[PDB]
């Protein structure tokens, strides 16, 4: 028992991480088979970051301009391309450590593990959700661009996120591995703001189920509510609407605990209307929304 924010083991991703340098600009790249993927703003100079014309910059570069370090081993670039906001740097040497992998784009409300790196060297691993407003609330300093987010299924690494940049509010923005940004953002050092965020209701309910599985029962009650009457309360507190498909996804957890989904919603309503009154749930005094139903089933089962 116990419930912690748990990342996937990061070994398979650590062996893919390289350093990429253009002149005095450096960041991380992802080395799979004979291609290194990295954020395209590695070709910007310090003063060309307010509105880079990435087509200029790339046509004026040559292969020998790209320094790729895989630890101590320098890697020879033998081809370069741009794909949306990432570069694909072809290299002569295929990565012997390439795991089986997929490029997937994730949905807001889904979680993934982040391997934060600096100068091609893994620094730490932690768990993130994609927020309804397409930002992530990560932990990233200068040098972290090119760090990737991922999920692991049996032996398959599904890469879903490459880090690019920090917004002024302190949250983070990036692309899928195909170079298309999550959310309405661009890779330029301009004023950009996220839309207003909401709370991921299905996740809060899943975390309430994790709590009940771990012995926290004080917020339970015997009232039930209807789906529409719960959504009226949700909208009032800036939670996203709950759908019938959310109720279905919660089925396994409703079955294991014997607490019907709409019964749990009555508890949630009460917590939103009343607060927690100095008690806690799974070591938190706020409602946590960064565990999916899958994440709960994964730990508690």
């Amino acid at each position: 028992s116990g419930f912690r924010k748990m990342a996937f083991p990061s070994g398979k991703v650590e062996g893919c991480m390289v350093q990429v340098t253009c002149g005095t600009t450096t960041l991380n790249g992802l080395w799979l088979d004979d291609v290194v993927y990295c954020p395209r703003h590695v070709i910007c100079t310090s003063e060309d970051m307010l509105n880079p014309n990435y087509e200029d910059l790339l046509i004026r570069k040559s292969n020998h301009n790209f320094l790729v370090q895989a630890g101590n081993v320098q890697l020879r670039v033998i081809g370069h391309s741009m794909q949306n906001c990432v570069l694909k740097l072809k290299v002569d040497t295929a990565n012997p450590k390439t795991p089986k992998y997929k490029f997937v784009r994730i949905q807001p409300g889904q979680t993934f593990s982040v391997l934060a790196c600096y100068n091609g060297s893994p620094s730490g691993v932690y768990q993130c959700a994609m927020r309804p407003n397409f930002t992530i609330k990560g932990s990233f300093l200068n040098g972290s661009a090119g760090s990737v987010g991922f999920n692991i299924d049996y032996d398959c690494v599904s890469f879903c996120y490459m880090h690019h940049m920090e917004l002024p509010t302190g949250v983070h923005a990036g692309t899928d591995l195909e170079g298309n940004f999550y959310g309405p953002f661009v890779d330029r050092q301009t004023a950009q703001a996220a839309g207003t965020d909401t709370t991921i209701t299905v996740n809060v309910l899943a975390w309430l189920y994790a709590a009940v599985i771990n012995g926290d029962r004080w917020f339970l009650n015997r009232f039930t509510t209807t789906l529409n009457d719960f959504n009226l309360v949700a909208m009032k507190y800036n939670y996203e609407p709950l759908t019938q498909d959310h109720v279905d996804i919660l089925g396994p957890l409703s079955a294991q605990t014997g607490i019907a989904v709409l019964d749990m919603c009555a508890s949630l309503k009460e917590l939103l209307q009343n607060g927690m009154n100095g008690r806690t749930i799974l070591g938190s005094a706020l409602l946590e929304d960064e565990f999916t139903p899958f994440d709960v089933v994964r730990q508690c089962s």
Binding site: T25, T26, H41, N142, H164
Partner: peptide, 8 residues
């Protein structure tokens, strides 16, 4: 005010 998070 966005900061691209390369280094140096």
């Amino acid at each position: 005010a966005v900061k691209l998070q390369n280094n140096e």
